[PDB]
Amino acid sequence: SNATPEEHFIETISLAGSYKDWSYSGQSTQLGIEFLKRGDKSVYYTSNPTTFHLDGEVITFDNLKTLLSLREVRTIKVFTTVDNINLHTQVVDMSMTYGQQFGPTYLDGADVTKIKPHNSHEGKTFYVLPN
Ligand SMILES: [Cl-]
Numbered sequence: 038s039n040a041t042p043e044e045h046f047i048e049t050i051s052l053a054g055s056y057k058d059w060s061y062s063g064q065s066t067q068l069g070i071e072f073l074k075r076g077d078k079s080v081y082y083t084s085n086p087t088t089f090h091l092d093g094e095v096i097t098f099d100n101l102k103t104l105l106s107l108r109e110v111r112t113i114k115v116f117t118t119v120d121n122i123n124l125h126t127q128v129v130d131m132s133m134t135y136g137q138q139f140g141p142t143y144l145d146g147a148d149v150t151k152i153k154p155h156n157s158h159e160g161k162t163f164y165v166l167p168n
């Protein structure tokens with residue numbers, strides 16, 4: 038029987054080994070076939086009928102393609118300080134500026150309010166206003 042667009046998408050990805058920055062798995066689990074993985078996220082599919090699942094929710098095929106192409110939300114860890122005495126280990130969303138997450142932010146005196154976090158910032162100390 039001729040592949041549906043959903044089945045064709047799965048089969049093509051299973052042969053190529055990935056879809057953009059998602060890795061093909063193919064592992065059979067209680068949640069269905071582990072289809073695509075990116076960081077801590079796994080898309081599954083069940084059969085009869087072909088149904089996609091992410092984070093305990095059924096997602097349609099059109100909505101899956103949108104979600105797969107969204108930029109991955111990545112994080113780094115930094116220290117924040119209000120005083121250069123007391124440092125707090127803080128997770129940073131790499132999709133947002135320092136300013137969006139912390140308010141006005143300096144790194145060794147340089148204003149990084151408008152800057153996006155980068156890997157090279159991991160473990161650095163940022164000076165912020167008190168909350
Ligand atoms: Cl799930």
Ligand SMILES: [Cl-]
Nearest residue numbers: 151152153154
């Ligand atoms: Cl930037």
